[PDB]
Structures are given as C-alpha cells and as structure tokens.
Amino acid sequence: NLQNIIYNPVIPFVGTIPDQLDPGTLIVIRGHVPSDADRFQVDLQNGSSMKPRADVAFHFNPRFKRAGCIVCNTLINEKWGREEITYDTPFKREKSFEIVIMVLKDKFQVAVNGKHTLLYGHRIGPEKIDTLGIYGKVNIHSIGFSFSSD
Ligand SMILES: CO[C@@H]1O[C@H](CO)[C@H](O)[C@H](OCc2ccc3ccc(C(=O)O)cc3n2)[C@H]1O
Numbered sequence: 001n002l003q004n005i006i007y008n009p010v011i012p013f014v015g016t017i018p019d020q021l022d023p024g025t026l027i028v029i030r031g032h033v034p035s036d037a038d039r040f041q042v043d044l045q046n047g048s049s050m051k052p053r054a055d056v057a058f059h060f061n062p063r064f065k066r067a068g069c070i071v072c073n074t075l076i077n078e079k080w081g082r083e084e085i086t087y088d089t090p091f092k093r094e095k096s097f098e099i100v101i102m103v104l105k106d107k108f109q110v111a112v113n114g115k116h117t118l119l120y121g122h123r124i125g126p127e128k129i130d131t132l133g134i135y136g137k138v139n140i141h142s143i144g145f146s147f148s149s150d
C-alpha cells in the first residue's frame with residue numbers, strides 16, 4: 001500500500017501530504033543520522049507557513065546530546081505545549097533508521113526499526129494535518145504513505 005511522495009529530499013524538506021491522515025494511515029520515513037547531528041525533527045503541520053509558523057500537530061524530535069532522547073510536542077499559534085519526553089531512544093549518530101508513524105483514532109503510534117518507540121495523543125485533529133516537514137541534521141532516503149482510504 002506504500003506510496004512515497006519523495007526520495008533523497010534536500011533537508012529542510014516540506015511537502016504536501018496527498019490524502020487525509022485517516023485512522024490506519026502509515027507514514028514511513030527511511031533515513032540516516034549524520035555523525036555530527038545534535039537533533040532533527042519530523043513535523044506534521046497544518047500548512048507550510050514560515051511567517052507565521054504553521055501549527056505542528058505532531059513534532060517528533062530525536063535529540064542526540066548525553067544519552068539521547070525523543071521530544072514530542074504540539075505547536076499551536078506559535079506556542080509549544082507540554083513536552084512528552086521518551087528517554088528510551090533507538091536513534092544514534094551515524095546509524096540508519098526506519099520510522100513508521102501509525103495514525104490511530106486518538107493518537108500516533110511510532111515504531112523505529114520495527115520496535116515500538118512511543119505514543120502521542122492527538123492535540124490537533126489529525127484531519128487538519130496537510131503538510132510534512134523534516135528539519136535539522138538528518139539524511140532522508142524516502143518518505144511515503146499508506147493511506148487507509150486506499
Ligand atoms: C526546548 O526548546 C524547544 O522545544 C520544542 C519542543 O518542545 C522544539 O523542539 C524547539 O525546536 C523548534 C525548531 C523549529 C524549527 C526548526 C527548523 C530547523 C531546525 C534545525 O534543527 O536546524 C530546528 C528547528 N527547531 C525547541 O527549541
């Protein structure tokens with residue numbers, strides 16, 4: 001069911017998601033963390049506005065300092081909510097990954113390299129998400145979608 005919208009995108013990458021993130025939709029991101037990365041993020045956005053900054057329904061932000069972590073949050077009207085921090089991170093500098101974001105009715109469920117990583121409850125209805133941004137120090141081989149409407 002997987003339709004990649006792009007291979008080997010230049011980062012930063014911002015792309016329109018070509019259908020609605022209905023429950024059962026998968027977002028699949030394959031890539032590699034450079035040796036010098038401090039952080040990168042996958043943002044599921046309401047639009048692509050830079051000024052002012054588009055709302056981010058789902059900010060998925062691996063951080064590499066110390067023992068590393070993943071920060072998840074929501075940006076509404078240019079303000080970050082309560083940080084959801086996962087200390088058990090599968091990401092490492094100079095290692096490849098596959099991220100699978102599963103869009104469920106009430107939350108995202110994220111697996112990396114085929115291992116469950118975290119949950120994140122919807123704070124913005126996922127129907128308002130139309131854009132995917134990838135920012136920071138990360139190399140991306142592919143971004144695709146398996147839409148539950150197909
Ligand atoms: C703790 O401080 C804030 O925490 C936010 C999540 O709670 C976010 O992770 C904030 O980062 C927002 C942000 C937003 C847009 C970005 C675009 C590019 C880059 C970059 O890493 O070069 C980084 C960018 N970082 C971070 O500054």
Ligand SMILES: [Cl-]
Nearest residue numbers: 104105106107
């Ligand atoms: Cl759910």
